[PDB]
């Protein structure tokens, strides 16, 4: 199978900036390289076939480029209808056919720091057995944010999952969910439970925390 | 315009059985080979499985191969995927495909033409969610930003719908995205961002509906005072 690369994962871009999008391939593919995009809630279309040859109705900002083990895709002039996930597929040795792992063009926006609180585990939730702990970033960009629990001083790991938001429609910023979950058994024989965000809009990682019975 | 319909996704067991259909309009069927691919939750594409214009060459992906058989009825203008011994790596949205090149079979591989695409989920049992209030607390200044929100907790399958106030409250509502527990079960939360002067005065209830086990749960969240 021939594995293809695409780095960088996300392409932070504003309208009308020049946007170029790297795919990569572990053996030659030749010039039998595809480009797809692929917009939320929609089926791929095709852009580009033959590495350089633009699909029926695409329109001329989109460029493609490269051989053998080396490919872009280049939007002249960034539409806001172009924000989107763009994919790149080899045709040259199938079966199998494969995609690189997608390139977000992401909508950029200034460094917007994150506003930061923390939920203890509700009595009814207890009461079953268990304990969620939620720490909750609100409106952050860019989407790189550092999580850590600290449970009486203790880190964490292992036990938390994160959730992060599709950027807000309005005004771009990402919030994220960070949630501990521990049995009713372990949260009660520990009183303070914190959660420390280190993000780059905080010029000092900012730590919110509670007392379990208080 | 041609038109690629897939149907037949839903529910089903691991180890079991189904039968996804793709109805083609719009073009000469016979004369095109016709392709699944695939698309796991927060994923990329996958190529499944492919099949000649003449219907006598098939491949497969290597992971599907023994448990998927691709198939065409060329003069009822249909595509089929049979899937058998479904794994939960299976669970998908499936897409038929249509190659854009007729008669040169060495430039098969491009997909001009996608169908919306059909959902398929592996499931071990239909669960509602429990609802538990993520209380404000004097944590935020009672002169800026509070938080607030409910914590919609071991379910399955997606989606579950939540408002506030019966969708009266929709400004600053962030709803994440479902994320799977280890137990296999979905966990999300709903936070909403008021200020810290309508603690108390504004009331605040969120409204989750599970429609796979006709859930509805309408959960007061209200402030602790320490």
């Known amino acids: 199978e021939i594995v293809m690369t695409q780095s960088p994962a996300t392409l932070s871009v504003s309208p009308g900036e020049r946007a170029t999008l790297s795919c990569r391939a572990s053996q030659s593919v030749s010039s039998n390289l595809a480009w797809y995009q692929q917009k939320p809630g929609q089926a791929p279309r095709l852009l580009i076939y033959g590495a350089s040859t633009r699909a029926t109705g695409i329109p001329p900002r989109f460029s493609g480029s490269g051989s053998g083990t080396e490919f872009s895709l280049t939007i002249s002039s960034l539409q806001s209808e172009d924000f989107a996930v763009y994919y790149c597929?080899?045709?040259?040795?199938?079966?199998?056919?494969?995609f690189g792992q997608g390139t977000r063009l992401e909508i950029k926006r200034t460094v917007a720091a994150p506003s930061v609180f923390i939920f203890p585990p509700s009595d009814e939730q207890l009461k079953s057995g268990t304990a969620s702990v939620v720490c909750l970033l609100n409106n952050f960009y860019p989407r790189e944010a550092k999580v850590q629990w600290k449970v009486d001083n203790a880190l964490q790991s292992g036990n938390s999952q994160e959730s992060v938001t599709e950027q807000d429609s309005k005004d771009s910023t990402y919030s994220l969910s960070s949630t501990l979950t521990l049995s009713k058994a372990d949260y009660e024989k520990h009183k303070v439970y914190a959660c420390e965000v280190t993000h780059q809009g905080l010029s000092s990682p900012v730590t919110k925390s509670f007392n379990r019975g208080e | 315009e041609v038109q690629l319909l897939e149907s037949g996704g839903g529910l089903v067991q691991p180890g079991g059985s189904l039968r996804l259909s793709c109805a083609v309009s719009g073009f000469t069927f016979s004369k095109y080979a016709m392709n699944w691919v695939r698309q796991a939750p927060g994923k990329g594409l996958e190529w499944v499985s492919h099949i000649s214009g003449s219907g006598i060459s098939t491949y497969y992906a290597d992971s599907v191969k023994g448990r998927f058989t691709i198939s065409r009825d060329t003069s009822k203008n249909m595509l089929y995927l049979q899937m058998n011994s479904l794994r939960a790596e299976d669970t998908a949205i499936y897409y038929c495909?249509?190659?854009?090149?007729?008669?040169?079979?060495?430039?098969?591989?491009?997909?001009?033409?996608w169908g919306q695409g059909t959902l398929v989920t592996v499931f071990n049992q239909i669960k509602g969610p429990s609802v538990f209030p993520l209380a404000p607390s004097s944590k935020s200044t009672s002169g800026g930003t509070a938080a607030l929100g409910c914590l919609v907790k071991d379910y399955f399958p997606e989606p579950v719908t939540v408002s506030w106030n019966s969708g009266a409250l929709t400004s600053g509502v962030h709803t994440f995205p479902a994320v799977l527990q280890s137990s296999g079960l979905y966990s999300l939360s709903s936070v909403v961002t008021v200020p810290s002067s309508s603690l108390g005065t504004q009331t605040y209830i969120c409204n989750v509906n599970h429609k796979p086990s006709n859930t509805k749960v309408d959960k007061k969240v209200e402030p602790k005072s320490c």
């Open positions: 495909a249509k190659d854009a090149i007729s008669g040169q079979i060495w430039l098969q591989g491009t997909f001009d033409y």
């Open positions: 597929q080899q045709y040259n040795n199938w079966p199998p056919i494969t």
